[PDB]
């Protein structure tokens, strides 16, 4: 079997270098071409550029040629792709995949790099809840807004799991440079306020976990 | 013989391959000049 | 630099029928073409290899053909698994130029959407600045307006949108948008509300809100 | 296999106007294209030949034209024998590929429809199976929506639609459908009913039927 | 004879943001392309030679861009002496095909139309023919249609209409339709009307007039 | 500075000939070519033909061909187009531009032919002013309309240019071979009729000036 491993995520500032690992295994090296694709969230994907391990040649294209750079290592079984003046536009998911036919016949696991100059910040939650002076009508969604937090993204639990069916977990947009996210969940007002809902967001690095009543 | 650089500019700097020949094309008009240097062998230039 | 054009970007059919996609170039590829499909989180997976051919591990199901600058992708019957984004890619010159895209959906009938607006939270003014929400569940299809109105006005920029895809079980969607900005413009009025139009029905849902309530 | 697209299906001019039907392909044809009437149930008649010159016995008022990959078909002006469907032929190259094909009608005002559902006979049960039928008249445009829903569903396939084009008297369409099926799905349910979507007006007519009336 | 199609012919952006102008030809060009800039009543004037380089004179914000058979016109940011009527040439063989032509107009909120129909003159008598007028103001955006009916007709030709463009003030739009004929078809009915069908409300205003009165 | 100097508008019968000037300045005349560029109203623009004055060889188009012929002196630093066999789809605006790296880089002023068989006649003003039976609103819009005037076009100026803002001036379209014009402008019936607006059209050509009251 021929199998791709990438390395994991990456997350520095603007104006720095970033070296990328792709290492094929079950497979001569050094006898196929070893590509590269770019895939900008969520609608873009274009072809990057090629490397031939045997004799180190690289073929470019346009907009990347000055920004990437490719080398590969024959002892290792690796290539490397290197960038140069990374900014917020460079940041998307990055594939490795290999020539044979022409075509891309096996791809890689992916990998994500951001790019920003923000820092670890813990996340705020703000309750939502109805309602004053508005009973309408017996049936409310619920949830609770998340602001505030790098890197994306947290989980938020209702009641330790209790319903996941009627919850949807919406995806986060970057605003003045944080994520925000939002939570909602419809319950009846017969059987509320009788339990208490608690939304709680877990962030693994800043280890920040918050919990709220309503 | 021996290679000529007849297109030498400051923005080729980066790039010294694009030195080694100049570009030719269709043209719209009658008689543009494509290209001049000096005959000097010792002169600094394209001779050098 | 070939251009190689993927339309419609979306189209939906339900379960056991049949779909057509056409990824059509500028020049002639002599035939060289590549289908992908991608999970959303997953990596692509190759399908057609030049046009025609099959690969090994790929159901029969999917069949593609093709003649000169039109080449489509039929698969038949449509199943769960195979809801995906595809893609198709031109082999032929450098640089190599991937399709457009299309991404699948199942077809449903219309439903109703529900507008409920939302009051900030009374701690939420400790932090320095006020964000006014109004949430949207259970609606369809995709394409839709969100209307801001305070005193007849519109404001951008500064909406945003969070679009929710669908998913296995209730094949539905969900939308929620808002806005952040400093303290003294809030109380500068009072009612509050927004609203959804939609194509099948001129006159929308109406959710208010008041804060002296 | 030269490909050569002939769009739209459908357009609609009224008499003493002109027409224009473009006929496009996908190479450079040298000028060679042959342009056909047919009447329903008739063969084909040949008007131009080599998008320019006339035949002998055909009118002067078919005046084709073009240039490079489009080509027109000028028609002035339009009388009540000039209204078939027309082809354009490519003889350039082999095989000659056959035009998609145009079918003209007389266009006029917008008409309501008559929805009437009609109960099965007392003695079709004996056959060993019921279809139930609501037949429509007076209507325009061709595009229509037929409509089946009991409590609140949709039923496919096994539904039919048979068209009737235009005559020269009133210039009216017609349409029918139903379904067969066993006996036992007949009585699951009571009340029958059927409608048909236009554009125009969101709020169509509605017939229903009840069995024990 | 080389067709070099501009589409469309109005689209519409507000000040501020940018706008897009796509110029496609049949053949390839050669990348010789020459974008113009022509006011109403004035001459054109050239903005962008050969699809990129930029003339002297002109300032940055108008950026071409392009390749192969597809040129786009990048204009941003948008403001009031930048509002004209945008062109395209083709210079590489003769003759040279110039491009349809791309109207920029401001874009704005929907705005309800005033429907007052007129008496003719008693003195207008005289001249031995007579006009029935009712002139609109104040509306958007430019696609409406014109209704004249009398005893549940429709009558053309004969009619007219005068549009007028906008200006810079209110960014607002007028009408005017009338009809000339003889002397005894005026009186030959009582009421006179007129309306003007828009997309986003079925049912439009009515202003009615009466002879009698 | 190079400079484009065309003619003035001309007005002739069908079946005639007419000859437009354009002379340039401040360049060398017999070096570069001059072009010629038809646009008819409002939709309609195509290229005509260009002469090159050293020699005197013309280029014409497929369908001008015949109708036009393209002359030159070299002593007056002049170009001339003449025009045969005008007819009515023959009057529209011409151009007069010069070709350089095969773009148009200066155009002309602009010249208006028109070609009629009408001849000049004094404009008749009908009033029109709500009205009788009808009160209906408190806001209506007044104006009048004028008809039979040759050629276009003609001013309407109200109470001496009072008030320019409501009013709107629209466009004249050829009626049974003359040109027709409408006025529109809003006042409210609080003040009307205690003020007695006018319409005046002026027209230099008939020196008729008619003024109306209401």
């Known amino acids: 079997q021929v199998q791709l491993q990438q390395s994991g995520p990456e997350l520095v500032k603007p104006g720095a270098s970033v070296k990328i690992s792709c290492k094929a295994s079950?497979?001569?090296?050094?006898?196929?071409?070893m590509n590269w694709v770019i895939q900008r969230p969520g609608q873009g994907l274009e072809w990057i550029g090629r490397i031939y391990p045997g004799d180190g040649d690289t073929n470019y294209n346009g907009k990347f040629k000055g920004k990437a750079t490719l080398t590969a290592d024959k002892s290792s079984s690796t290539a490397y792709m290197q960038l140069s003046s990374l900014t917020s536009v460079d940041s998307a998911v990055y594939f490795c995949?290999?020539?044979?036919?022409?075509?891309?016949?096996?791809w890689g696991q992916g990998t994500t790099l951001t790019v920003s100059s923000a820092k670890t910040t813990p996340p705020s939650v703000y309750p939502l809840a109805p309602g004053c002076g508005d009973t309408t009508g017996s049936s409310v969604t619920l949830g609770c807004l998340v602001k505030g937090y790098f890197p994306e993204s947290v989980t938020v639990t209702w009641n330790s799991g209790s319903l996941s069916s009627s919850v949807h977990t919406f995806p986060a947009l970057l605003q003045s440079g944080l994520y925000t996210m939002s939570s909602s969940v419809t319950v009846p007002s017969s059987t509320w306020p009788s339990q208490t809902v608690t939304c709680s967001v877990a962030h693994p690095a800043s280890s920040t976990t918050v919990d709220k009543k309503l | 013989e021996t290679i000529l650089e007849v297109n030498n500019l400051k923005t080729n700097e980066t790039t010294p391959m694009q030195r080694l020949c100049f570009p030719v094309s269709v043209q719209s008009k009658t008689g543009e000049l494509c290209a001049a240097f000096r005959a000097d062998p010792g002169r600094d230039g394209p001779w050098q | 630099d070939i251009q190689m054009t993927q339309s419609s970007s979306y189209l939906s059919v339900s379960l056991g029928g049949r779909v057509t996609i056409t990824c059509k170039a500028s020049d002639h590829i002599n035939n060289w073409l590549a289908w992908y499909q991608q999970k959303p989180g997953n990596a692509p997976r190759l399908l057609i290899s030049?046009?025609?051919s099959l690969e090994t591990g790929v159901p029969s199901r999917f069949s593609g053909s093709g003649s000169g600058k039109d080449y489509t992708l039929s698969i038949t019957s449509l199943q769960t698994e195979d809801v995906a984004t595809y893609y198709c890619?031109?082999?032929?010159?450098?640089?190599?130029?991937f399709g457009g895209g299309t991404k699948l959906e199942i077809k449903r009938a219309d439903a109703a959407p529900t507008v409920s607006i939302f009051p900030p939270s009374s701690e939420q003014l400790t932090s320095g600045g006020a964000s006014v929400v109004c949430f949207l569940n259970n609606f369809y299809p995709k394409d839709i307006n969100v209307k801001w109105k305070i005193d007849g006005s519109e404001r951008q920029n500064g909406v945003l949108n969070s679009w929710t895809d669908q998913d296995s079980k209730d094949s539905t969607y969900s939308m929620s948008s808002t806005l952040t900005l400093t303290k003294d413009e809030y109380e500068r009025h009072n009612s509050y509300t927004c609203e959804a139009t939609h194509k099948t029905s001129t006159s929308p849902i109406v959710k208010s809100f008041n804060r002296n309530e | 296999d030269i490909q050569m697209t002939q769009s739209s299906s459908y357009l609609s001019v009224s008499l003493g106007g002109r027409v224009t039907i473009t006929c496009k392909a996908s190479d450079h044809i040298n000028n060679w294209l042959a342009w056909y009437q047919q009447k329903p149930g008739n063969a084909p008649r040949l008007?131009?030949?080599?998008?320019?010159?006339?035949?002998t016995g055909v009118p002067s008022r078919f005046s084709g034209s073009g240039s490079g990959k489009d080509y027109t078909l000028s028609i002035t002006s339009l009388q009540t024998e000039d209204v078939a469907t027309?082809?354009?032929?490519?003889?350039?190259?082999?095989?000659?590929?056959?035009?998609?094909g145009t079918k003209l009608e007389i266009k006029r005002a917008d008409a309501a429809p008559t929805v009437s559902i009609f109960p099965p006979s007392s003695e079709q049960l004996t056959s060993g199976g019921a279809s139930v039928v609501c037949f429509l008249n007076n209507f325009y445009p061709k595009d229509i929506n037929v409509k089946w829903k009991i409590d609140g569903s949709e039923r496919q396939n096994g539904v039919l639609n048979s068209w009737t084009d235009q005559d020269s008297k009133d210039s009216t369409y017609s349409m029918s459908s139903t379904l067969t099926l066993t006996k036992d799905e007949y009585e699951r349910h009571n009340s029958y009913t059927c409608e048909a979507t236009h554009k125009t007006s969101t709020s169509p007519i509605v017939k229903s039927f009840n069995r024990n009336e | 004879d080389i067709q070099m199609t501009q589409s469309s012919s109005y689209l519409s952006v507000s000040l501020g943001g940018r706008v897009t102008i796509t110029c496609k030809a049949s053949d390839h060009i050669n990348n010789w392309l020459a974008w113009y800039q022509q006011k109403p009543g004035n001459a054109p004037r050239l903005?962008?030679?050969?699809?990129?380089?930029?003339?002297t004179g002109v300032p940055s914000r108008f950026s071409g861009s392009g390749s192969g058979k597809d040129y786009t016109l990048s204009i941003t940011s948008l403001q009031t002496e930048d509002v004209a009527t945008?062109?395209?040439?083709?210079?590489?063989?003769?003759?040279?095909?110039?491009?349809?032509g791309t109207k920029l107009e401001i874009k704005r909120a929907d705005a309800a139309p005033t429907v007052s129909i007129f008496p003719p003159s008693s003195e207008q008598l005289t001249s031995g023919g007579a006009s029935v007028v009712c002139f609109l103001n104040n509306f958007y955006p430019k696609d409406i249609n014109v209704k004249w009916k009398i005893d549940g007709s429709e009558r053309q030709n004969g009619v007219l209409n005068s549009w007028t463009d906008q200006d810079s003030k209110d960014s607002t739009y007028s009408m005017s339709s009338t009809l000339t004929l003889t002397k005894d078809e005026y009186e030959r009915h009582n009421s006179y009307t007129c309306e003007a069908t828009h997309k986003t409300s079925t049912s439009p205003i009515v202003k009615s007039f009466n002879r009698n009165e | 500075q190079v400079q484009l100097q065309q003619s003035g508008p001309e007005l002739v019968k069908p079946g005639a000939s007419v000859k437009i000037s354009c002379?340039?300045?401040?360049?060398?005349?017999?070096?570069?070519?001059?072009?010629?560029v038809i646009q008819r109203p409002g939709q309609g623009l195509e290229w005509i033909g260009r002469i090159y004055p050293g020699d005197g060889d013309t280029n014409y188009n497929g369908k001008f061909k015949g109708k036009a012929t393209l002359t030159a002196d070299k002593s007056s630093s002049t170009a001339y187009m003449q025009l045969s066999s005008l007819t009515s789809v023959d009057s529209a605006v011409?151009?007069?531009?010069?070709?350089?790296?095969?773009?148009?880089?200066?155009?002309?002023?602009g010249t208006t032919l028109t070609v009629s068989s009408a001849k000049t006649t004094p404009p008749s003003v009908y009033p029109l002013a709500p009205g009788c039976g009808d009160t209906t609103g408190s806001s209506v819009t007044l104006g009048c309309l004028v008809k039979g005037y040759f050629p276009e076009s003609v001013t309407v100026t109200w109470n001496s240019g009072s008030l320019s803002s409501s009013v709107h001036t629209f466009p004249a379209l050829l009626q049974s071979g003359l040109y027709t014009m409408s006025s529109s402008v809003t006042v409210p019936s609080s003040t009307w009729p205690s003020q007695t607006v006018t319409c005046s059209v002026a027209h230099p050509a008939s020196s008729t000036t008619v003024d109306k009251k209401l």
């Open positions: 995949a290999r020539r044979d036919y022409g075509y891309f016949d096996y």
């Open positions: 079950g497979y001569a090296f050094s006898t196929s071409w």
């Open positions: 890619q031109q082999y032929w010159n450098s640089p190599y130029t």
């Open positions: 030049g046009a025609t």
